[PDB]
Structures are given as structure tokens and as C-alpha cells.
């Protein structure tokens, strides 16, 4: 088991009950691959440096999990089956690195 | 079809010629000119002077459709570059800022042998 | 794949046999079998309408399921992967939880013991049939219907597949195994995956007789006939074509495009 941070970007135009729609499937999957959530930050709408998918904005989620390392790749494969999931970025959790310190 | 006050002005500036297309705000060309439309053929099209006439003539056709202002986007290194910008500023056409939109591959297609050179 | 042979005869040096290790069915087939009337290339008049056919092994026809939209929602275990003599591909046996058995044409990667299902539901997974409209753009798929409810038509040959390139209204754009680009209706079923047994195309027949087993009788060049018989028939030795190359019925056989111009299907085609 290992600590990853799962960044996921969603269609902005989704209404809130649809956002929760896409967000459940996310969560069964997480629970299905064995991802045990720890933190979470749902930062919602955000403004993009470039369009993802013809869209100046995208709806952000970030999870932090402990899941068996070998199932992470399929996790993200499955997470990404979209259509409304426009990004998945799954990173290994790291001990922060500080400047001016 | 339509006549517009505000607009946009494009400079394609290459070594062999300089060409200026002026658009509507939405980007569709109103009218255009180049080193050749001025009446040059050949290498003299690449020159800085002909680029001047080019841009003046571009604007003169646009101002006849009632162009007033433009946003002037330039692309590419060439001796036609600045004299084209210069020519637009004091021509007619209050020019609102300026940009360099010149295309720069993030290391794309292998270039022609002519531009490969040092590796 | 692809069994080779030491040259202990000529033609054993070049012969190449399919790999059967994917196959779990030994000989017998499930009595979804039915008998095949071999034509000899002859039509209902006794007349050969397709030349150089006939001979070749007796075959039982395995009846196979080209509409998956009966069993919508009912899943099935993949029971066996079997050999079917009527197609390049392999059939997979399905035991439905219904208790019903069907043959599916067996996709690449599909394992014995998998669960399969078909319907607007269903995961996007190898074996699963869905209306095309619900298959995510980009997934490669086989066994497509051309019009809805009419049965799978496209990408059924071993190793073939198709790709979903886009949506437009009630249609999706597919790239067919031909490379043609075709609008198909969204409602049409398709089943995700490539067909597989894709090593099929590398078999080397190897000797004359092996073509004879597949019911292909010897094929004779127009060049070798007389002119009664063929546009190339004639003239002393050998001899070149002497004219633009022709079929026996006399139409041109290099380049002449034969698809009917005004076909209604042309509104829905975009390519080669």
C-alpha cells in the first residue's frame, strides 16, 4: 500500500447533481481498486491557463489515498474512461521540499 | 456585406516577402495586401520598403470599409517586420497594442536540411 | 502462433499451420451445430456462377449470435473457445445465466471464465456488446451493425477491428477495416475489442492440396485460354495482354471502379 494524490478535472458545465453523478463512480472505483481515501480537497471551478477540451475552465477534485501500488495504473485507466473526466493525474505522495528554509 | 469600425491586423513577415491581412474582430479577413500586390516581383518583395507600401495599402483598403482601429498581430522574423508595424501606426488606424504570435515548435517535425545546420 | 515444419517433404518446408492453443473445445461442437449445404459455386439453375469452387472438407455450420440485443442485461460466462471452419475467426461459447447457450465470434483477449454482457449498460470491456452511441469515442470495436437491428456485418474477420472516431447527430463515424470512413447509426450494436486470431493472415498454405481442402479448385489464367474463352486467349507464345487487362466477361480489371454511383449509401460514406 502506498500514498498517492489523485488529481481529477471534470467538465465544468455539469450541473451539481451531475457532478455528484460523476463523483460517485469515481468513488466506487476508488473503493473497488482498494483506494482508501485520507484527505480530499474539492476546489470546484477554476480558471485554466489553456483550454482543456475547448473550455476556459474545469472542475477540480483532489483525493489522497492509500491503495495497493500495483492497482494504481488500472485505477487511472478506469478513472479516465470519462466522457466527463477530462484529466486524471495520479502522483506519488511526497515529503514537501521547502525554499527559504 | 458589412462594414466595421474595430478590427484586427495580421503581419506574416518572412524573408522572401511580407504580407498583411486585416480582419474583422472575429478574425475573418476584410482585405489584404503583400509585397507583390504593391507591384514587386521576386526578391524585392522581401525588402523592408515594399512591406511599408504593403501595410499602407492594406490599411487604405480597410479604412475604405470604415476600419478605425486594429490589434496588429505579427508573425515571423523578416526585414519587413518593423517597417510594417511602423507603417500601420502612423497611417490611419489607431493601433491598440501588438503581439508576437510567431509559431515556435516545442521540437516538432524535423526541419528541411536548410534550417537544420548546427545540431 | 504459426506452427512451422522441418522440410521432411517439399512443401513441408514452407507450410505453416494455425496455433490452436487458444482452443479449449477439442473436437466436438455444441449442438447449436446445423448442416451446411455446399454449393460448388453453382446457383439454383445448375450453373456455376462463381468459378473454381468445390471439393474440400465436410463442414457443420456453427450458428452464431450476430444480434446481442436479445440478451440485454443477462450476463454470461465464457464457457469455451472453439474452432469454427466457416470463418477466419474463432467462436467463443457462452453459457448465459439464463441457461441459454449462444456462440459469439471470439474477440482478442477474451478469456474462458469471463463474464460477458450486452446492453446500453455494461462496462466498456472486451466481449461486451453495446449500442454504438454509448461506446466511448476512440475505443476499438468489432462485429458492428450497419443499420440498427439488422445484425453484425463489419469487422468479423480474424484480426479485424473498427475504431470510433466521432459523433455526429444520430450517427457515429467509424473507421472500417478497409480504412474507409463511414457514418453508422448510434443505435447499432457493436462489441468492444478487436476480433483477433490475428495471426491468421500469416498462415502459409504451402502446397497445392491445402488450397483444395478449403474448397478452392485450381484457378486458370485468361492468358492460358484461347480467344473463345477469354480476352487474353491466344497468339503463339506467351504473349502480353494486347489490350487493357480484362475479366472473362470482358470488363477492365485494373482500376475500373465498380461501385454503383447513385447508391443511397453514399450520403453516409467518407473514404477509401
Amino acid at each position: 500500500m502506498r500514498r498517492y494524490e489523485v488529481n481529477i478535472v471534470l467538465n465544468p458545465n455539469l450541473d451539481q447533481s451531475q457532478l455528484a453523478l460523476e463523483k460517485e463512480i469515481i468513488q466506487r472505483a476508488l473503493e473497488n481498486y482498494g483506494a482508501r481515501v485520507e484527505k480530499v480537497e474539492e476546489l470546484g471551478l477554476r480558471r485554466l491557463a489553456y483550454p482543456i477540451a475547448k473550455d476556459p475552465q474545469g472542475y477540480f477534485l483532489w483525493y489522497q489515498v492509500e491503495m495497493p501500488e500495483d492497482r494504481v495504473n488500472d485505477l487511472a485507466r478506469e478513472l479516465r474512461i470519462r466522457d466527463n473526466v477530462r484529466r486524471v493525474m495520479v502522483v506519488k505522495s511526497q515529503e514537501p521540499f521547502l525554499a527559504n528554509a | 456585406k458589412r462594414q466595421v469600425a474595430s478590427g484586427r491586423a495580421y503581419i506574416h513577415a518572412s524573408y522572401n516577402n511580407t504580407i498583411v491581412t486585416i480582419t474583422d474582430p472575429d478574425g475573418n479577413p476584410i482585405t489584404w495586401s503583400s509585397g507583390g500586390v504593391i507591384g514587386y516581383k521576386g526578391s524585392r518583395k522581401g525588402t523592408p520598403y515594399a512591406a511599408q507600401l504593403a501595410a499602407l495599402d492594406a490599411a487604405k483598403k480597410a479604412m475604405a470599409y470604415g476600419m478605425q482601429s486594429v490589434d496588429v498581430i505579427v508573425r515571423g522574423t523578416g526585414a519587413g517586420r518593423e517597417q510594417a508595424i511602423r507603417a500601420l501606426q502612423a497611417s490611419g488606424l489607431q493601433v491598440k497594442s501588438i503581439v508576437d504570435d510567431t509559431p515556435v515548435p516545442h521540437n516538432g517535425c524535423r526541419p528541411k536540411k536548410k534550417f537544420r545546420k548546427a545540431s | 502462433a504459426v506452427k512451422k515444419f522441418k522440410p521432411y517433404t517439399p512443401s513441408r518446408r514452407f507450410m505453416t499451420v494455425a496455433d490452436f492453443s487458444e482452443i479449449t473445445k477439442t473436437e466436438p461442437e455444441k449442438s447449436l451445430v446445423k448442416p451446411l449445404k455446399k454449393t460448388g459455386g453453382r446457383n439454383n439453375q445448375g450453373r456455376i456462377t462463381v468459378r473454381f469452387r468445390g471439393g474440400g472438407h465436410k463442414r457443420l455450420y456453427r450458428i452464431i449470435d450476430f444480434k446481442r440485443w436479445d440478451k440485454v442485461g443477462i450476463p454470461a460466462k465464457v464457457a469455451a473457445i472453439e474452432y469454427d471452419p466457416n470463418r477466419s475467426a474463432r467462436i467463443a461459447l457462452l453459457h448465459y445465466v439464463d441457461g441459454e447457450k449462444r456462440y459469439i465470434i471470439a474477440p482478442d483477449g477474451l478469456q474462458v471464465g469471463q463474464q460477458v454482457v450486452a446492453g446500453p449498460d455494461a462496462p466498456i470491456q472486451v466481449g461486451n456488446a453495446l449500442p454504438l452511441r454509448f461506446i466511448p469515442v476512440g475505443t476499438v470495436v468489432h462485429a458492428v451493425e450497419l443499420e440498427p437491428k439488422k445484425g453484425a456485418k463489419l469487422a468479423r474477420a480474424a484480426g479485424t477491428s473498427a475504431q470510433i472516431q466521432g459523433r455526429e447527430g444520430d450517427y457515429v463515424i467509424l473507421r472500417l477495416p478497409s480504412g474507409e470512413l463511414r457514418k453508422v447509426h448510434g443505435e447499432c450494436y457493436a462489441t468492444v475489442g478487436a476480433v483477433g486470431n490475428a495471426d491468421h493472415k500469416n498462415i502459409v498454405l504451402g502446397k497445392a492440396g491445402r488450397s483444395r481442402w478449403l474448397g478452392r479448385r485450381p484457378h486458370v489464367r485468361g492468358a492460358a485460354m484461347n480467344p473463345v474463352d477469354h480476352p487474353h486467349g491466344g497468339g503463339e507464345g506467351r504473349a502480353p495482354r494486347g489490350r487493357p487487362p480484362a475479366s472473362p466477361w470482358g470488363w477492365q480489371t485494373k482500376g475500373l471502379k465498380t461501385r454503383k454511383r447513385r447508391k443511397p449509401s453514399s450520403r453516409f460514406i467518407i473514404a477509401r
Binding site: 488529481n7 482543456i52 | 503581439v99 | -
Partner: protein
């Protein structure tokens, strides 16, 4: 040429953290390129970590790949 050192300007910060634009936004040029070590004032080891982070950041859409050049 004088300007600033651009590391100087802000306090302790995590150069590992790829989600905060307003820190990282300051390390990009007027056209959006990762700023050379000289005017970031970072270390050797530190500039790599910064960079790699910035790369990630752009993939997530938070940081640009390129802006244009204005008012020449």
C-alpha cells in the same frame, strides 16, 4: 540588467507542491517559459524540483505552456 532574484520575494514555500499557481505563476516569463536559474536565484538541486513541478502544473491546466509577447 538589475531586477530581482524572485526567490527573495516570497517566504518559505514548498517547491514540491504543484497546485498553487500564485507562487509558481511568478517563476514564468511574460511569454510563459520557466525562468532561467540566474533570475530565479534557486540552487542546482532546487531548480530541477521547481521545473518538474511546473511541468506537472501545466498538464493540470493550472500553468500555461506559452503566452504571447505584448507591446514590443
Amino acid at each position: 540588467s538589475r531586477k530581482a532574484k524572485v526567490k527573495a520575494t516570497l517566504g518559505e514555500f514548498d517547491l514540491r507542491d504543484y497546485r498553487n499557481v500564485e507562487v509558481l505563476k511568478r517563476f514564468l516569463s511574460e511569454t510563459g517559459k520557466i525562468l532561467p536559474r540566474r533570475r530565479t536565484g534557486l540552487s542546482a538541486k532546487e531548480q530541477r524540483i521547481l521545473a518538474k513541478t511546473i511541468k506537472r502544473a501545466r498538464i493540470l491546466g493550472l500553468l500555461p505552456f506559452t503566452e504571447k509577447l505584448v507591446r514590443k
